[PDB]
């Protein structure tokens, strides 16, 4: 007999056993990204090559404009979006909703006038032009703030995001641009120093418009690799504001799957399918198109997004309309950086060398491989001398998720073309759409599907005819969630979440148990599965921190001490799993931290030692993560010896200033301080008061008081 796992589907529906199909247990694919970036640029320009090709006179880089371009005559992807059709869809959406555009725009403006510059510190890695690399958002923002100070640019000290965006827009006009660059001076040692460097206006414009690239290695279910783009800090404010506006608009739209996540999305899915089933005529058919859009960002022109921003803010202050239209302008004239370049080697001499991108065309193309040969022969027209590709048309993945979703919902909501005897409506979310078409027969259902496909092709949207299919309503999939006959199996993909959280013992344990309980609540993880997950997690947790049961004969550094503690203390049911104690957690008490769980079972000496008011292993500065576990997940833990932190792997200026302010005003670490005065004088007054109180209480000597007073005296606030 020859076994066959697929035969399981003979006796079980695929959706029921869908979890086993996905290989979400092996090693996810991982990676030069220059080839992929060049290919992406090539495809983006190829789809829009028939547009209007001109040369930007502000930067000198070639630009291709597909908007209002020739209507496609083939199924191939098309970025030729007609502006009038986009405005028609927007107008239909506006008519179908009561002043939604006005409310969303006003709320976006109000929350923008309240936003601070420091909000730009959130997010992921960002392109830094002072070094032309990818740096953490906080560091990039700090460096750009520092550089702006030299060229007479200010507004960061002014607080709100409005002055920062205003002086960012101003910076594009300064005849020069001075900043600090890293200089790895040789002395042999390579020591980094700060060198005051300057660049011209064109170079600065190119740097600001440049989009850095990286390989999307983390992907799990795709063989071919995609490139993710990181933008600079000079686009983050505008992109953030437009994204917030689009989120405000799309949240009300019942057709939008974002930004709601979790059981809310399932609720929306089931409610929508039930609605469409209810709305079907008598004996008619409601067909569901399971769609998976491709080239969702290589066909969306930023000019269409500029038009959408202008139409959305039809009635708003001129200043806000201008401000929110900057992001589409910056994206419509963007430039793409190109990885690290190809590598050429000779095997007859065992020699290899990576060729930096600026030197791509310094070599005869007859030496690159034929594929890269064609890639470069096609990329030559748009190649910048500095080593960047002029990429005007299209968008990089991840920038305008909300705005693209709003455009998709606009396409969905037309609901009819030519008053044909059918209707359509659906769910759209960031490159994944599920459509429903109701008619009186299958033929009319596909007439409607074809009409919707054509309408999508009029906005740059090109549904994938290879990754999509159609069937009867009541069975489909949306964003990897499967619906069949009312049964929505949360596809079990949260399996790679049972490892230790890697923050500390107690916190890792709390996070793991909360993860188990949340999975039980949401994904339908059965009680036996939850018990086995507890078992496996406890095994991994004991192994990773070298703390097994004290009785067990395992050897280790901390294990000897655990063994000692095992008999040095009588009460053996109160020890923690980090102290070789017996596991006590079960399904009924996953919501209780174990320290409180075992509080009764502990011994007075043990609880006194572990729960000491002061612990050298516990520090105030270590409390930052006690609320949210990095997605920010809330976990409940208990102060104790096991609440420690791991070793670390104008910087010092800001860091130590903030640290000292926190140490002076202990309330600052919890809630935002309030005051319209310099930090120095606040600290001086507080320290003077504290010194006087310490002396009056006898905690400080008289010589100590005099010294303190002198210092505080010198400072100038006594």
């Amino acid at each position: 007999m020859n076994i066959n796992p697929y035969f399981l589907f003979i006796d079980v529906p695929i959706q029921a056993a869908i979890s086993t199909t996905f290989p979400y247990t092996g090693v996810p694919p991982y990676s030069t990204g220059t080839g992929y970036t060049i290919d992406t640029v090539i495809r983006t320009h190829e789809y829009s090559n028939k547009g209007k090709q001109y040369i930007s006179d502000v930067t000198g880089c070639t630009m291709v404009d597909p908007t209002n371009g020739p209507l496609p005559e083939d199924n191939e992807p098309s970025a030729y979006a007609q502006l009038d059709c986009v405005l028609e869809a927007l107008d239909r959406m506006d008519e179908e909703h009561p002043g939604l555009f006005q409310a969303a725009s006003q709320n976006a403006m109000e929350t923008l006038m309240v936003t601070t510059v420091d909000k730009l510190t959130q997010g992921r890695q960002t392109f830094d032009w002072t070094v032309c690399r990818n740096q953490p958002a906080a560091t990039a923002l700090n460096t750009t703030i520092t550089s702006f100070r030299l060229n007479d640019l200010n507004g960061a000290d002014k607080g709100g995001l409005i002055p920062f965006c205003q002086d960012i827009i101003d910076s594009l006009d300064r005849p020069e641009m001075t900043f600090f660059s890293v200089k790895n001076i040789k002395k042999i040692k390579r020591i980094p120093m700060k060198v005051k460097d300057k660049i011209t206006k064109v170079e600065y414009i190119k740097r600001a418009l440049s989009l850095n690239t990286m390989t999307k290695d983390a992907e799990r279910g795709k063989l071919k690799r995609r490139a993710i783009a990181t933008a600079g800090i000079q686009i983050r404010g505008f992109v953030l504001v437009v994204e917030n506006l689009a989120k405000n608009i799309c949240e009300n739209l019942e057709q939008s799957g974002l930004p709601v996540g979790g059981n809310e999305k399932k609720a929306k899915l089931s409610n929508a399918v039930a609605k469409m089933l209810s709305n079907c005529p008598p004996g008619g058919i409601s067909m569901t198109v399971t769609g998976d859009n491709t080239k969702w960002n290589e066909c969306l022109n930023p000019r269409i997004f500029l038009a959408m921003t202008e139409r959305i803010t039809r009635d708003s202050p001129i200043w806000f309309r201008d401000f929110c239209s900057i992001a589409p302008v910056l994206f419509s004239n963007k430039i793409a950086r190109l990885g690290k370049g190809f590598m050429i080697t000779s095997k007859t001499k065992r020699l290899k060398a990576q060729i930096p991108c600026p030197d791509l065309f310094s070599i005869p193309l007859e030496r690159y491989n034929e594929e890269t040969r064609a890639k470069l022969k096609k990329l030559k027209p748009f190649f910048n001398e500095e080593g960047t590709a002029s990429l005007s048309p299209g968008m990089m993945m991840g920038m305008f998720n909300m705005l693209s979703t709003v455009l998709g919902v606009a396409a969905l909501g037309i609901k009819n073309i030519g008053n044909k005897e059918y209707l359509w409506d659906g769910l759209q979310s960031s490159d994944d759409f599920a459509l429903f078409v109701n008619a009186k027969d299958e033929e009319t259902c596909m007439e409607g599907i074809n009409d919707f496909y054509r309408t999508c092709k009029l906005l740059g949207i090109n549904m994938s005819k290879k990754k999509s299919y159609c069937n009867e309503t009541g069975m489909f999939e949306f964003t990897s969630m499967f619906y069949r006959d009312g049964f929505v199996s949360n596809f079990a993909m949260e399996l790679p979440s049972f490892g230790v959280a890697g923050v500390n013992e107690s916190a890792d344990m709390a996070i793991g148990m909360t993860i188990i309980k949340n999975n039980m609540i949401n994904n339908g993880m059965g009680p036996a599965t939850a018990q086995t997950a507890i078992q496996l997690f406890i095994a991994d947790y004991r192994y990773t921190y070298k703390c097994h049961r004290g009785d067990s004969k395992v050897e280790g550094k901390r294990m000897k001490i655990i063994k000692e503690l095992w008999e040095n203390t009588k009460g053996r049911d109160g020890l923690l799993v980090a102290d070789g104690g017996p596991n006590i957690y079960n399904l009924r008490n996953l919501h209780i931290p174990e320290i409180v769980l075992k509080y009764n079972l502990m011994d007075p000496e043990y609880k006194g030692r572990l729960l000491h008011p002061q612990n050298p292993f516990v520090g105030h500065l270590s409390i930052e993560g006690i609320k949210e576990a990095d997605k920010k997940m809330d976990y409940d833990a208990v102060s104790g010896t096991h609440s420690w932190r791991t070793k670390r792997n104008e910087e010092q200026c800001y860091a130590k200033c903030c640290n000292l302010f926190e140490a002076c005003f202990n309330s600052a670490s919890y809630r935002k301080p309030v005051g319209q005065h310099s930090m120095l004088e606040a600290m001086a007054h507080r320290l003077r008061m504290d010194a006087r109180l310490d002396y009056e209480s006898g905690r400080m000597s008289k010589d100590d008081f005099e010294k303190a007073m002198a210092h505080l005296g010198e400072i100038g606030y006594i």
Binding site: M113, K158, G160, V674, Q676
Partner: protein
């Protein structure tokens, strides 16, 4: 006339007692502090 920085100008100093001026100033200071916490203070622009 009362200002947000805990100072005032009165044509006659006997028109209002200590409690009234203290209470109005406390309300103004609370409003200022709440605005600063919400960052509306800088955005706020006076009667001119």
């Amino acid at each position: 006339i009362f200002s947000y920085n805990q100072d005032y100008s009165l044509s006659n100093e006997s028109s209002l007692d200590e409690e009234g001026k203290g209470r109005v100033l406390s309300r103004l200071t609370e409003l200022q502090a709440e605005l600063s916490l919400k960052n509306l203070w800088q955005v706020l622009i006076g009667e001119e």
